[PDB]
Amino acid sequence: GPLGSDDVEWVVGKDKPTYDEIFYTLSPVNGKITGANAKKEMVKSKLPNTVLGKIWKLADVDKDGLLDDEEFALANHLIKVKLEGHELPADLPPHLVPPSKRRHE
Amino acid sequence: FNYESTNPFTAK
């Protein structure tokens, strides 16, 4: 193939349009949503406050206090696995973390 | 130890 060495697959990239659709239903200003919008989302997700804060702590890898469609998709993926009866590692492995926040010099 | 919490779910 092209690389072989680096053949990484972002798990969220396979079910991103769904969390993306949910992202648009929260009214995204300048392409992001504020804490309020993702808050009400996590509010009715029926997850504990602690988990919600932890998911946010993983989602905003960009650290801009706002959630882009990338970051919200990450959050929704964590919430989805929660709903599916799983736990989120509370950590950002190389297959959870969006390459959009990897700046190399 | 307090730090600038930027998490709107906890605030503190």
C-alpha angle A62/A53/A41, rounded to 5°? Answer: 90
- A1-105 is a CATH 3.90.45.10 domain: no
Read out DSSP for B1-12?
A: -------TTT--
Chain B residues whose CB is inside 8 A of the A65 CB are 6
**Among A59, A55, A37, A57, CA closest to A47:** A55
């092209």: which residue's tokens?
A: A2
User: Residue A77: how many CB atoms within 10 A of its CB?
Assistant: 24
Task: Give the whole-angstrom CA distance, residue A23 versus residue A69.
Answer: 6
Task: Give the whole-angstrom CA distance, residue A30 versus residue A9.
Answer: 28
Q: Report the phi/psi class of residue A27: left, alpha or beta, with left for phi > 0 and alpha for psi in -120 to 50.
A: left
Residues A33 and B8: beta-carbon distance below 8 Å = no
- For A67, phi and psi rounded to 5 degrees? -110, 110
Task: Parse chain A into domains and list their residue ranges.
Answer: 1-105
**A43 at interface of B, judged by CB pairs closer than 8 A:** no
């309020």: which residue's tokens?
A: A36
Is A87 assigned to a binding site? no
Task: Give the whole-angstrom CA distance, residue A24 versus residue A34.
Answer: 12
